[PDB]
């Protein structure tokens, strides 16, 4: 084992590698969404900026897990980053709804990771997940839920001004 | 076609999508290298920082191509980002040599993209590639070649102090 | 020939003179649009400001071509600047759509100029066009396409608040 | 009629449209002169700058008339901007003499516009012309007359140093 | 081949070496001219300063080509820098005329280099030449043409005050 | 003779012209060395910078002699600047050793020039040489000797880290 490794179960190391991939995947999904909103036929710059920021955030999340993996003496094993499920994200509302789904999926994975950490009596990993991931996820989910709610209430996407004005006032 | 599209051949659009993937792939390779140097049994923080910066740069390169694709009215089609060929990059020198190979490969792809742009009489794309990609690549290749040279001359990796001191003095 | 003239084909000189006229024409079209939005019965001040700025930009484009013509030892031959096709531009959306058409037309002329420059092996002129004109055009076309998209989505011009709010939020 | 229109005779509206065209024409003439002085075989940069500034000033004059037309509820009708009478302006002195002629012509048109405004009992228009146009014209005419005088006295254009030194000392 | 070399034809490498020599030669010619104007029997300090600056600029041009050669993995091969054709440059006008000839000659060489780069499908080199050399040359040629024009118009060199005053007002 | 010439022997004027050429030659040699260290397979940036600075210094030395020649009413006669003896300078140590040889050669020439000045009872020239050249040379020779010593002691060039570390610590 790594000279630093202590109380770091192989199952945790594997789960962290999986989580890294998921974070990178989420980054890629958000990048896809950002690019969609930059299309000339979509042209919602603040949706684009929002999702680009999310993409960058997810990359940071992945990098922080990579740092954790090395800190604990695990070994990072990267996997392909799968392309997002869609190229065309349909609408600001649909993208926000998909983002919410993605964030909940990531959260579910983090909760499973936390359960694993607890099961393996790895409090450092538990704490790491709780501290840096779970609160962030809850905040993200709430924010996306709020965005979805607002867009839906505003009549998006059928109401043409809804996404535009949400783009300006909420995302701008 | 997109309302903005003008003089943008489908072959160029496809080539740009391929280049986006290659840039994202290069980003991922450099991320892999960065993580390797952050291993406790490698522990070259400035190599890690160097490659992380390269990873971020490659992502920026990809994002700029995505912006180009949308600016020209092409449509971004993302593909899986393949995992890097290696998890273990062996040494600072070997990583720099692999980086040089990667950069030359990316450069070759950009040169092919430029040839395509010239062939399709797409001077905007030609100019974009020349302006933002080809000079950057040449600079990157030269810098990596310089690093490789220096590491080799210093006796890396067999000479234990070579990578350490290169990490401090060239990359620090 | 002019003492400075070198590698500057008469066909290029002529094409540049034509481009100057086209830029001045575009300036005039945008001035027409600006004035339209300043009508009391239209009263979209930020559309007016947008198009006035475009008018000024096009004049700058023309002046830069005039500077090029003299720099290369060609001789500027001015022609009448034709009045714009319309006095009444109908709506913010219609003006933006017409602007997009105009910009694409100007771009097409620049692409033809670039082809001529390449054909005459005039790399200075090629570079000048690429550097100062083609990227600007692509950006302009994309921006107008984005504006058109947004106005259309917002329901312009039938939806009374669309142009108003676009005027405030996008153009203000 | 326009909801704002009050005491604005159709003849005034027409005269203003004519004046707009004349100002734009004057702008174009001065642009032509500026370009001439930027020729490598003329190369009087401060003459070029002087006339370019005049061109910009005339454009501003036209824009201010357009603003007036809209303020009064008239409708701007643009016409072709005729090319200047000359491509080659011969000399700094000849250009200044032609500028003086042009300015006097513009002044004459403004005086006719003022007479029309007085005839139609349009004191706002009278005041506008007096305030923003007639004093400017007199100043411009005097300045050009002064320049012509000085250039003539200096021996322009036959005395080779005259235009050069006038360019440096009066226009620089 | 050099580890960095990619898409860099030997003919380009040779042409770059030739261009380096030509730039160094031009530097030397301008140094010769500068020294001439510093003679007590010529004593035009701003002509001297002008040409000295040009000499330094040409050296920078040569150094930038040397940097390019190394960046692309070519090898610099220096040749003798031939002495200038003249020790005595006769007059400010004659020097400016000779400078114009030299600049056009350098430009012609750069155009040939660009043609070679295009022929060898070396867009990096093409871009480098266009970006850093061809626009600079056109500007230089125009500036020298302007100087020649002005000196000729002022009556140089027979008119004793022409060079003196040009030295003060244009070059000072 | 020149109106300023006083106590300036033709032999001194000739010797100064020879010295100018030698300084320009030394400049060129150092430029050659600088370029060598910028090769990707050498890649010692601070050696490159060191020699480039020396090249610039030698050019300044030449220019100062040119100024002297004109100040004394001699006439500068330039000669070809011969290419350096080598394209490949082998190593940092070998370049420093060659630089030392070159500097000693230049010093020897300056000493001969001083002897000539003393022989011709030209104290201004003697003083000029002593003041601006001889102390500089001694300093340069000592500095290069120190560099050679250090590189030799460090085990250059066989000891791979020697040039690297000297580049960083002494030249950086
Ligand atoms: Na995340
Ligand atoms: Na890249
Ligand atoms: Na334009
Ligand atoms: Na006017
Ligand atoms: Na040059
Ligand atoms: Na020296």
Author numbering:
A (entry chain A), B (entry chain A), C (entry chain A), D (entry chain A), E (entry chain A), F (entry chain A): 5 to 176
The authors write:
Here, we report a sub-1.2 Å resolution structure of apoferritin reconstructed from images collected with the CFE beam. More than 2,000,000 particles from ~7900 image stacks gave a 1.21 Å resolution map, and the final resolution reached 1.19 Å by rescaling to finer sampling with the super-resolution pixels of the K3 detector. The cryo-EM map resolves separate densities for individual atoms, particularly in the core region of the protein complex, while side chains at the surface of the apoferritin spherical shell seem rather flexible with some residues showing multi-conformations. The weighted difference map reveals many densities corresponding to hydrogen atoms. The number of hydrogen atoms associated with the protein model is 905, which corresponds to ~70% of total possible hydrogen atoms, after picking the atoms at a density level of ≥2σ and selecting manually based on their riding positions (see “Methods”). In the protein core, most of the hydrogen atoms are identified for both the main chain and side chains. The hydrogen density in the hydroxyl group of Tyr 168 is bent towards an oxygen atom in a neighboring residue for hydrogen bonding. The amino- and oxo-termini in asparagine and glutamine can be clearly identified by the presence or absence of hydrogen densities. However, in the weighted difference map, there is only a small negative density at level ≤−4σ near the terminal oxygen atom of Gln 23 and no around Asn 25 but larger and more dispersed negative densities at the same level around the side chains of Asp 171 and Glu 17.
We here present charges and bond properties of hydrogen in a sub-1.2 Å resolution structure of a protein complex, apoferritin, by single-particle cryo-EM. Indeed, imaging with the CFE beam or through the monochromator yielded single-particle reconstructions of the protein complex apoferritin, which is often used as the benchmark for single-particle analysis (SPA), at 1.25 Å and 1.22 Å resolutions. Hydrogen bonding, bond polarity, and charges in protein molecules play critical roles in the stabilization of protein structures, as well as affecting their functions such as enzymatic catalysis, electron transfer, and ligand binding. These effects can potentially be measured in Coulomb potentials using cryogenic electron microscopy (cryo-EM).
